[PDB]
Write an enzyme that holds these catalytic residues in place. Structure first.
Site, PDB file in Angstrom:
ATOM      1  N   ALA A   1       1.628 -22.750 -38.935  1.00 50.84           N
ATOM      2  CA  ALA A   1       2.590 -21.924 -38.206  1.00 50.84           C
ATOM      3  C   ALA A   1       3.639 -22.776 -37.480  1.00 50.84           C
ATOM      4  CB  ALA A   1       1.856 -21.016 -37.163  1.00 50.84           C
TER       5      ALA A   1
ATOM      6  N   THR B   1      -2.272 -16.140 -45.360  1.00 50.84           N
ATOM      7  CA  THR B   1      -0.907 -15.675 -45.589  1.00 50.84           C
ATOM      8  C   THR B   1      -0.642 -15.321 -47.012  1.00 50.84           C
ATOM      9  OG1 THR B   1      -0.025 -16.943 -43.748  1.00 50.84           O
ATOM     10  CG2 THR B   1       1.513 -16.557 -45.494  1.00 50.84           C
TER      11      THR B   1
HETATM   12  B1  LIG Z   1      -0.674 -18.093 -43.134  1.00 49.60           B
HETATM   13  O1  LIG Z   1      -0.385 -19.355 -43.973  1.00 49.60           O
HETATM   14  O2  LIG Z   1      -2.188 -17.869 -43.424  1.00 49.60           O
HETATM   15  C1  LIG Z   1      -0.139 -18.361 -41.569  1.00 49.60           C
HETATM   16  C2  LIG Z   1       1.395 -18.573 -41.540  1.00 49.60           C
HETATM   17  C3  LIG Z   1       1.994 -18.881 -40.193  1.00 49.60           C
HETATM   18  C4  LIG Z   1       3.500 -18.830 -40.157  1.00 49.60           C
HETATM   19  C5  LIG Z   1       1.504 -17.892 -39.160  1.00 49.60           C
HETATM   20  N1  LIG Z   1      -0.774 -19.557 -41.068  1.00 49.60           N
HETATM   21  C6  LIG Z   1      -1.683 -19.627 -40.122  1.00 49.60           C
HETATM   22  O3  LIG Z   1      -2.077 -18.618 -39.511  1.00 49.60           O
HETATM   23  C7  LIG Z   1      -2.294 -20.976 -39.845  1.00 49.60           C
HETATM   24  N2  LIG Z   1      -2.710 -21.201 -38.488  1.00 49.60           N
HETATM   25  C8  LIG Z   1      -2.107 -21.956 -37.587  1.00 49.60           C
HETATM   26  O4  LIG Z   1      -1.217 -22.696 -37.844  1.00 49.60           O
HETATM   27  C9  LIG Z   1      -2.705 -22.080 -36.190  1.00 49.60           C
HETATM   28  C10 LIG Z   1      -3.143 -23.251 -35.781  1.00 49.60           C
HETATM   29  C11 LIG Z   1      -3.739 -23.347 -34.528  1.00 49.60           C
HETATM   30 CL1  LIG Z   1      -4.139 -25.037 -34.112  1.00 49.60          CL
HETATM   31  C12 LIG Z   1      -3.884 -22.337 -33.621  1.00 49.60           C
HETATM   32  C13 LIG Z   1      -3.431 -21.133 -33.953  1.00 49.60           C
HETATM   33  C14 LIG Z   1      -2.857 -21.050 -35.223  1.00 49.60           C
HETATM   34 CL2  LIG Z   1      -2.184 -19.584 -35.777  1.00 49.60          CL
END
Ligand SMILES: *[B]([O])([O])[C]([C][C]([C])[C])[N]C(=O)[C][N]C(=O)C1=[C]C(Cl)=[C][C]=C1Cl
Ligand SMILES: *[B]([O])([O])[C]([C][C]([C])[C])[N]C(=O)[C][N]C(=O)C1=[C]C(Cl)=[C][C]=C1Cl
Ligand SMILES: *[B]([O])([O])[C]([C][C]([C])[C])[N]C(=O)[C][N]C(=O)C1=[C]C(Cl)=[C][C]=C1Cl
Ligand SMILES: *[B]([O])([O])[C]([C][C]([C])[C])[N]C(=O)[C][N]C(=O)C1=[C]C(Cl)=[C][C]=C1Cl
Ligand SMILES: [Cl-]
Ligand SMILES: [Cl-]
Ligand SMILES: [Cl-]
Ligand SMILES: [Cl-]
Ligand SMILES: [Cl-]
Ligand SMILES: [Cl-]
Ligand SMILES: [Cl-]
Ligand SMILES: [Cl-]
Ligand SMILES: [Cl-]
Ligand SMILES: [Cl-]
Ligand SMILES: [Cl-]
Ligand SMILES: [Cl-]
Ligand SMILES: [Cl-]
Ligand SMILES: [Cl-]
Ligand SMILES: [Cl-]
Ligand SMILES: [Cl-]
Ligand SMILES: [K+]
Ligand SMILES: [K+]
Ligand SMILES: [K+]
Ligand SMILES: [Mg+2]
Ligand SMILES: [Mg+2]
Ligand SMILES: [Mg+2]
Ligand SMILES: [Mg+2]
Ligand SMILES: [Mg+2]
Ligand SMILES: [Mg+2]
Ligand SMILES: [Mg+2]
Lengths: 204, 201, 202, 196, 216, 213, 220, 203, 196
Positions: B49, B1
């Site tokens: 997320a 992100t």
């Molecule tokens: B970014 O910090 O890279 C992004 C921000 C969120 C709001 C989308 N974070 C993530 O993509 C981190 N991933 C997850 O939290 C996650 C965990 C699991 Cl267990 C499964 C799918 C996802 Cl997306």
């Protein structure tokens, strides 16, 4: 995982009288892209290429040391190496390091230097060979690549159709992988020519 | 992100990418990382997320209760402090959240960084997430309080874009918002593949 | 595993169960754990299947060569000493609980234990392997000085049957061997031929 | 913690490195030089673990000089980069791995300028610009934003300065001075230090 | 239970036309020791339902206590409703999941067999609350050794008679005695039909040791 | 170290159309190198307008679907209407987050009709993060399915292709094809494919055979 | 993997499946697991694929040197000794689990060989992650002195039991039949599994893929 | 420890060794491991000395109160169930391998095992403690249906003597008790009174 | 990483703190204030773990203010320092310890100026001068060398400046600006920031 430190993806694919081999172009270290034109596919002959995914330092070392062996082989023997024999040469090189391996899992794509029959294979990091009649894949998005290849590939494709299929398999597979991409390169190998293309590709 | 925000003469610019990841698997290219808390307040998401979405939604609920009870808009300071106090209790339990709270209140344009480690700080500019170091470089070399509106949009867009290019965990689209005195507006949503075509050394 | 050997006047009796396990899977239900080392010298093997087979093969080699050079039958004590030397030297890399038993013309019927660690002791009778725990009391109460060959066979079969009933790592068939000047006699007790003791119903 | 940067223009390569040698919480030297001259037109910039960095850099340096003495001409930048690589890779699984990160900058009579990046694993990449250290995280995007392949040497020194000013502003470490050098058809030139 | 103590091995189950049969040996093992050689690992729950349990025998006894008291409680009401096999299976699923979710499991894997309203019921529940239904089931080593045989028969002929299901269970119990170092050749077979639940035993399988002379 | 989790496999997929939604799953339930049963689908009907797919640890799949069922009845009782697809999704987010510190080991995809009768897909992570999607794959073979859907439904990486609306008959074909491809390569995906088609007329079911090895 | 062997009246039948996996992903659908040792001796391999390949190739080669020298057909005992002494020396780090079968001057012989170097000589054996499924078939149906076709039926059923009940096994059944008079290498013996057929078409026409750069290099 | 009990027609025989150890130090060479829980109900104790004493005291208390309330002698099965309930409930915090044996007017002579983990099973005879491993074979070969009291005493003394010879954790004296309708008879075998089997020296 | 310093003269206490808020490799704020006004003549300077520092400082601040409102006069510096200590010590073996290090500076009508040092363990010492942070390692000896009990306020600002210059020269972290305040009989006075 050691194999995801640099990321990366290669695949090869067979058509009628032709073969294709493709790779992403990212050289990165964990999250950080360092360059976007890193070579992972290397000519081992006029109609025979090896693609290596895995730890970038071993991609380079295995390509180089393979080339050393091959050059000696060709000078000594009368001749250009057969695809199957290259596989074996590579198998032997990797298994010599059975107890501290190179972290690379190559694919080979070529035409027989006398018959021009299509050949593709892959090997694991300790040199187990797998010859197939359709496609092979190696890298951090192997599952994505398998999904595309299984759905798209068809027997006896002409050079134009093989190009489209390998390209779409690669682009869409790497687009689901954070540490592969930044460009795709594709080589189509025919009796009479090699065609090399970089694809329009996402750069995130 | 990669998320960013900056105060300037004409309010606060807020921008983010849209990628989510599960390890190195890209789970989405279409996440909305800017949450609309009310028409005068935005929050950004980076980290976990589920953690960001849960706690920012809870912030939205509480800001609304506040507004009903007190008959006035909550301040940026107070909103950021409500979030800080809620997460403080969970320190050490593995919450992962880095947020910017962005608004315009009686003290003018407002911007606070808040995270799950317990930080809460006011400032002129921030970037948060795995791509923040890349965004900081471009944002910092172009930032001024006296940026024109369209120059400010350009800067935010470009900074996120550059972060998507270096950072494996940032990508998708650039989503850009502008907090003005009468409310935020959504300015644009540009795919990074279309921005690449356009830019620009 | 349960292994056993017993001296009598003029020879020895050896026995073993027949179970090889990996975890609680039985990889061989009819293992032959009594292995000839020379014409009238056997070892009973317990512990690691790989380790005991490799050591038995190596001692068979050493003893065969020694015996040709001397042009005489080997001493049972010599076979035991060769086992001991290898099991003691490599005690940190081997898991082997051995009984060596046989006949020679100088000392007659003899039984030697080479337990894990590689000590060696001569005994009137020996028991080993995991199942042996369950039969210490039985053999201590039942052993009599001066048993005949046939009594030694019965004593061994009973002991092994009792152990096999209780030890998850022992089971299958009972393999017996008798060794004397006249040669080696091998047999298998299977099914209903295994001595039977009722489970104690109320 | 150590910072290296390289920028390759049409007929030169510009390089810079911080001048701090640190230990625990103190800067112990403020005029440290992280560059090693390999040949008339080659600099190796080397950071990483104490002891491994000098031992490795000097071994390579002495062997490049030896090649010159044996053969009467110098290794090209590319050949020197590959020599450097083979040594680092060959030691990686040995009893004596070297924990070093490097830039190699050079000018070849026939190939022009070259900048090479190598990490401790001995992956080698040619690049139009590159950087090492934690400081790279804050400066690579400034280079992506403003670099062009035809960048003149005056503008490359300006671009360099923007990166170094970004470290002053944003980086947690006190890196107040940097060595700067350029390599071109006429060899290696010392520029003035960029200080704060 | 954190650490199982006396345990039982495989339980088998197979549906047949008009009922269900389950089988389990009568052994409680203490590590490798075949310690308690005459214990029943099958329970009659009520007239339509029976239960077999692998794993910790003390935990099985506790379940027997709890479930037996629940059927008594229900019988006291004499109101024309009885727990179906499916209901008992559901209850067990919840009880095991709940115990798992307190990090204090009941260390068992169970097979519930029943007959109600002309339908055979066979269901599995494990210590983690994993549960499902199937035409045949086998816990423990049974899953590797018995289940392949059960499913191969059931493919050639999905509907088995009672005497065919029973011959098939005997064959599986034999293979288990050959290949599972924690089995014992003393078992029970329990059957549920229209007529209720019958538990037979102690039973033994014939064995063949011919291979002892083919060291080949 | 008792572990309260085990992986039981399973692949789920949903697709939003203009006036339909598809939720599909394989029917294999696995553990370790073994198959528990070949007939354990991963889809559950919630209302006439909403189906949920759940894979992962089966103990949690079962518990969570029972919790959702109870909460739908509670909602109906207090509010005098069935929960919408959107409200089911928002609710599920909160149920998943209630276990933030001992998570349900479940991947969830909701497929149904929204309040204008249009297809709606919501996809979740195990602790409740979600969003609306046009299509989504989840579970064991998700990484195999998703790229093909990106390409063929999203039209990604294609030039000179008309972006037509997705018919039911093309979406069905896609669904069957991607599962047949997953069954080739994912050891957990097999036996049978179960498809639920949600439209204004109700929910209908197709089943197709998959490889059994 | 599911590999198995049986001694029948007149020889040996060996069997194997053809799946190889990398993680819980199928990497090869048509892996050949029945390896040549000598014209009268074959060897099924389970475990680490590079190790089964290399170990059987090395022993086959050293056995060829042995037979060239003796002028005689090799013995199964010889392949067994060589394999076990090598695997013992490597202490279990060569992850080869083998089913070794052949016919020599003393008749048919079958051995199972484990990675740490233990071997068992038995009339039927099984190895691999599907070995218990295949063993259950053998315990239930093996008879001594089966006829050729009965023994082939039984080994294919045993392999099938692994293919269908073990996630590590799949795809085809290969057999090898070895008698005094004959060697039948039956690859495939049976194809019990098949990919379903494709319902849609994704035949992407020329120009679908956008291209940045192209170079044709003509060859001879 | 080695503990044992045997049913006969009209009663039970119980026995134990007398050795308490901490590490390989014998802290008590004449321990009484057979403890009365009521007039005609005993438990034999193995495992932790502290745990088994605490549990026996608690059960004695529960059973004594129960018995006054009912105004009848307690059932042996009731004593066993009380031991079981406590040993099962607290199985994670107790190291207790128990035999409950006794007589009551309803069911006569009875023997119950409550091994570690807290299962309960009625048996014709039971053995427990570390030394019991060494006498499984002996008891399996020697047990006979229908033994008299005096034969059960001899069988028990022999079994315990064999175990005590082999198990480092068992030793000392043998304590025996016989329980029947007529009451409880206790005795000690010590020194030369302990059955003796020769160490098997070489011919 | 955070620097606090205090210098007590005959009738004043001078205090200073760095103005950096950092996270990972980046300074995220350069005008951060680590001082909390407790009363007209008391400053609490607080560094340590994120979240704990502000929560703890503000809880104390609010309670000190509350004492004033309940009682009509203020807590003395000493009494405030002990209140501060009781709270920190009472939390130390609780479920909610605060990982904070503090200076408390004050002027009392009757006792004069006072400077107190407290660590996260809640040990409290009065001192004529003191400092926290890694920076303390490089500055405490400068204070031991030049401090006297009659140091004037002008000379204390110079001594403070020598300490801050030493951080610029010798400390590995980039701390370019500091808050400076002085407390005396007329309350709390903001001085100019000392910047580099
Ligand atoms: B970014 O910090 O890279 C992004 C921000 C969120 C709001 C989308 N974070 C993530 O993509 C981190 N991933 C997850 O939290 C996650 C965990 C699991 Cl267990 C499964 C799918 C996802 Cl997306
Ligand atoms: B017995 O000690 O229980 C028995 C004696 C051997 C000599 C036959 N031992 C075992 O069964 C121990 N098992 C193994 O060594 C073994 C067997 C197999 Cl098939 C594979 C691995 C192992 Cl480690
Ligand atoms: B079977 O034992 O499950 C099978 C036997 C081989 C001969 C095909 N083994 C496997 O499939 C296990 N996998 C591999 O050895 C393997 C490992 C690695 Cl690191 C990479 C590729 C393969 Cl194909
Ligand atoms: B026997 O199980 O070996 C015996 C039975 C008890 C009930 C008397 N057990 C022990 O001797 C075990 N020892 C202890 O519990 C012990 C004794 C002493 Cl004196 C101090 C500490 C401990 Cl842990
Ligand atoms: Cl080489
Ligand atoms: Cl978006
Ligand atoms: Cl409020
Ligand atoms: Cl602030
Ligand atoms: Cl800009
Ligand atoms: Cl053996
Ligand atoms: Cl031993
Ligand atoms: Cl032994
Ligand atoms: Cl057996
Ligand atoms: Cl019993
Ligand atoms: Cl019952
Ligand atoms: Cl051999
Ligand atoms: Cl004693
Ligand atoms: Cl009492
Ligand atoms: Cl016990
Ligand atoms: Cl006990
Ligand atoms: K047994
Ligand atoms: K599959
Ligand atoms: K003793
Ligand atoms: Mg990618
Ligand atoms: Mg990116
Ligand atoms: Mg070193
Ligand atoms: Mg399979
Ligand atoms: Mg070993
Ligand atoms: Mg205790
Ligand atoms: Mg804390």
């Amino acid at each position: 995982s050691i194999m995801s430190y640099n990321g990366g993806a290669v695949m090869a694919m067979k058509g009628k009288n032709c073969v294709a081999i493709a790779a992403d172009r990212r050289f990165g270290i964990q999250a950080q892209m360092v360059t976007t034109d890193f070579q992972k596919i290397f000519p081992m002959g006029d109609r025979l290429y090896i693609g290596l995914a895995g730890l970038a330092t071993d991609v380079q070392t295995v390509a180089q040391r393979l080339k050393f062996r091959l050059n000696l082989y060709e000078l000594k023997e009368g001749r250009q190496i057969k695809p199957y024999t290259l596989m074996s040469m590579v198998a032997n090189l990797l298994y010599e390091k059975r107890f501290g391996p190179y972290y690379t899992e190559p694919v080979i794509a070529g035409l027989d230097p006398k018959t021009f029959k299509p050949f593709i294979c892959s090997l694991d990091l300790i040199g187990c060979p797998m010859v197939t009649d359709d496609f092979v894949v190696s890298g951090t998005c192997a599952e994505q690549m398998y999904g595309m290849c299984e759905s798209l590939w068809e027997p006896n494709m002409d050079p134009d159709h093989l190009f489209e299929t390998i390209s779409q398999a690669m682009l869409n597979a790497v687009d689901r992988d954070a540490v592969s991409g930044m460009g795709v390169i594709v080589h189509i190998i025919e009796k009479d020519k090699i065609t090399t293309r970089t694809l329009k590709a996402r750069m995130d | 992100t990669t998320t960013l925000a900056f105060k300037f003469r004409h309010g606060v610019i807020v921008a983010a990418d849209s990628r989510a990841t599960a390890g190195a698997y890209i789970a989405s290219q279409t996440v909305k990382k800017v949450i609309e808390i009310n028409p005068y307040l935005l929050g950004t998401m980076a980290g976990g997320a589920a953690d960001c979405s849960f706690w920012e939604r809870l912030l939205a609920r509480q800001c609304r209760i506040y507004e009903l009870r007190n008959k006035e808009r909550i301040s940026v300071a107070a909103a950021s402090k409500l979030l800080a106090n809620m997460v403080y209790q969970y320190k050490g339990m593995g919450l992962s959240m880095g947020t910017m709270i962005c608004g315009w209140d009686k003290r003018g344009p407002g911007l606070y960084y808040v995270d799950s480690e317990g930080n809460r700080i006011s400032g002129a500019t921030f970037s948060v997430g795995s791509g923040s170091v890349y965004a900081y470089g471009v944002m910092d070399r172009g930032y001024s309080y006296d940026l024109e509106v369209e120059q400010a949009y350009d800067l935010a867009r470009r900074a996120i874009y550059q972060a998507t290019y270096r950072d494996a965990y940032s990508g998708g689209a650039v989503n850009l918002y502008h907090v003005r005195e009468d409310g935020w507006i959504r300015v644009s949503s540009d795919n990074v593949a279309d921005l690449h075509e356009k830019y620009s050394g | 595993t349960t292994i056993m050997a017993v001296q009598f006047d003029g020879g020895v009796v050896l026995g073993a169960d027949s179970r090889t396990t990996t975890g609680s899977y039985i990889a061989n239900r009819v293992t032959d754990k009594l292995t000839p080392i020379h014409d009238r010298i056997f070892c009973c093997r317990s512990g690691s299947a790989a380790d005991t087979q490799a050591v038995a093969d190596a001692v068979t080699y050493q003893l065969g060569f020694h015996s040709i050079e001397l042009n005489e039958p080997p001493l049972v004590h010599t076979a035991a000493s060769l086992f001991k030397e290898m099991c003691y030297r490599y005690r940190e890399d081997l898991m082997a609980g051995i009984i060596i038993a046989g006949w020679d013309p100088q000392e007659g019927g003899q039984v030697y234990s080479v337990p894990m660690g590689g000590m060696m002791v001569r005994q009137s009778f020996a028991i080993g392997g995991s199942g042996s725990s369950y039969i210490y009391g039985y053999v201590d109460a039942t052993y009599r000085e001066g048993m005949t060959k046939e009594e030694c066979l019965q004593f061994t079969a009973n002991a092994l049957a009792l152990a096999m009933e209780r030890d998850g790592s022992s089971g299958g068939v009972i393999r017996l061997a008798a060794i004397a000047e006249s040669g080696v006699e091998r047999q298998v007790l299977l099914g209903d031929q295994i001595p039977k003791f009722a489970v104690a119903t109320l | 913690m150590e910072y290296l940067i390289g920028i390759q223009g049409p007929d030169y390569v510009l390089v810079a490195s911080d001048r701090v040698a640190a230990s625990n919480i103190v800067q112990m030297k403020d005029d440290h030089d992280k560059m090693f001259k390999m040949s008339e037109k080659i600099l190796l910039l080397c950071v990483g673990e104490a002891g491994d960095t000098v031992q490795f850099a000097e071994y390579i340096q002495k062997n490049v000089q030896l090649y010159k003495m044996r053969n009467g001409y110098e290794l090209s930048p590319t050949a020197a980069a590959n020599f450097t690589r083979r040594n680092l890779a060959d030691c990686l699984r040995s009893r004596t791995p070297y924990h070093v990160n490097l830039l190699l900058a050079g000018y070849d009579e026939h190939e022009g300028p070259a900048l090479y990046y190598m990490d401790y694993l001995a992956a080698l990449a040619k690049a139009p610009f590159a950087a090492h250290g934690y400081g790279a995280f804050l400066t690579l995007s400034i280079l992506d934003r403003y670099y062009t392949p035809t960048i003149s040497r005056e503008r490359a020194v300006e671009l360099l300065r923007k990166c170094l000013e970004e470290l002053q502003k944003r980086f947690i470490l006190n890196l107040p001075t940097f060595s700067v050098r350029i390599i071109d058809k006429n060899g290696i030139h010392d520029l003035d230090n960029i200080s704060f | 239970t954190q650490n199982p103590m006396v345990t039982g091995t495989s339980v088998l189950g197979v549906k047949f036309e008009g009922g269900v049969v389950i089988a389990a040996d009568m052994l409680g093992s203490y590590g490798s020791l075949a310690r308690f050689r005459n214990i029943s690992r099958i329970m009659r729950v009520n007239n339509s339902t029976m239960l077999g349990a692998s794993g910790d025998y003390a935990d099985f006894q506790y379940l027997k206590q709890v479930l037996g008291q629940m059927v008594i409680d229900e019988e006291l009401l004499g109101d024309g409703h009885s727990y179906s096999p499916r209901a008992i299976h559901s209850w067990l699923t919840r009880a095991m999941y709940s115990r798992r979710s307190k990090m204090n499991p009941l260390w068992n894997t169970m097979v519930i067999g029943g007959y109600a309203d002309g339908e055979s019921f066979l269901g599995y529940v494990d210590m983690l609350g994993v549960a499902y239904e199937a035409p045949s089931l086998a816990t423990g080593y049974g899953a590797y050794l018995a289940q392949p045989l059960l499913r191969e028969v059931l493919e050639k002929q999905p509907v088995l008679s009672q005497t065919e299901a029973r011959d098939l269970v005997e064959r599986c119990m034999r293979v288990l005695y050959y290949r599972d170092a924690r089995s014992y050749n003393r078992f029970q077979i329990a059957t549920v039909t229209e007529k209720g639940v019958e538990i037979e035993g102690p039973l033994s399988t014939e064995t063949n040791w011919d291979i002892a002379h083919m060291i080949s | 170290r008792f572990s309260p989790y085990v992986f039981n496999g399973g692949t789920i997929l949903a697709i939003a159309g203009e006036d339909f939604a598809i939720v599909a799953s394989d029917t294999r339930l696995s553990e370790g190198f073994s198959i528990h049963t070949r007939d354990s689908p991963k889809c559950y009907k919630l209302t006439d307008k909403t189906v949920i797919g759940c894979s992962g640890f089966h103990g949690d799949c079962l518990t969570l679907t029972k919790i959702i069922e109870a909460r739908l009845k509670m909602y109906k009782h207090s509010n005098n209407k069935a929960m919408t697809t959107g409200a089911i999704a928002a609710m599920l987010s909160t149920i998943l987050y209630s276990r933030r510190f001992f998570p349900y080991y479940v991947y969830n995809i909701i497929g149904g009709l929204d309040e204008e009768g249009k297809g709606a897909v919501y996809s979740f992570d195990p602790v409740g993060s979600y969003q609306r999607d046009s299509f989504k794959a989840g579970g064991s073979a998700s990484a195999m399915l998703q790229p093909l859907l990106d390409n063929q439904v999203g039209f990604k990486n294609m030039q000179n292709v008309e972006h037509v609306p997705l018919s039911l008959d093309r979406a069905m074909r896609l669904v069957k094809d991607v599962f047949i491809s997953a069954a080739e390569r994912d050891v957990y995906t097999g036996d049978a494919l179960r498809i639920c088609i949600v439209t204004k007329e109700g929910i209908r079911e197709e089943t197709v055979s998959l490889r059994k090895d | 993997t599911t590999i198995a062997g049986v001694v029948y009246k007149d020889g040996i039948v060996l069997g194997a499946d053809t799946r190889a996996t990398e993680g819980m992903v199928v990497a090869d659908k048509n892996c050949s697991k029945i390896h040549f040792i000598s014209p009268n001796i074959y060897c099924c391999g389970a475990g680490t694929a590079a190790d089964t390949d290399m170990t059987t190739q090395l022993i086959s080669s050293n056995l060829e040197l042995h037979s060239l020298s003796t002028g005689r057909l090799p013995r199964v005992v010889t392949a067994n000794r060589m394999l076990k002494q090598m695997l013992f020396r490597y202490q279990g780090y060569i992850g080869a689990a083998l089913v070794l079968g052949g016919v020599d001057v003393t008749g048919p012989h079958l051995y199972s060989i484990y990675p740490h170097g233990s071997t068992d000589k038995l009339p039927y054996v099984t190895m691999g992650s599907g070995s218990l499924a295949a063993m259950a078939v053998f315990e239930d149906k093996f008879r001594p002195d089966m006829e050729e076709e009965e023994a082939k039926n039984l080994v294919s059923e045993a392999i099938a039991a692994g293919i269908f009940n073990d996630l590590g096994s799949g795809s085809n059944i290969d057999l090898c039949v070895i008698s005094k008079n004959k060697l039948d290498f039956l690859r495939p013996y049976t194809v019990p599994n098949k990919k379903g057929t494709r319902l849609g078409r994704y035949r992407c026409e020329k120009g679908t893929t956008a291209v940045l750069t192209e170079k044709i290099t003509p060859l001879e």
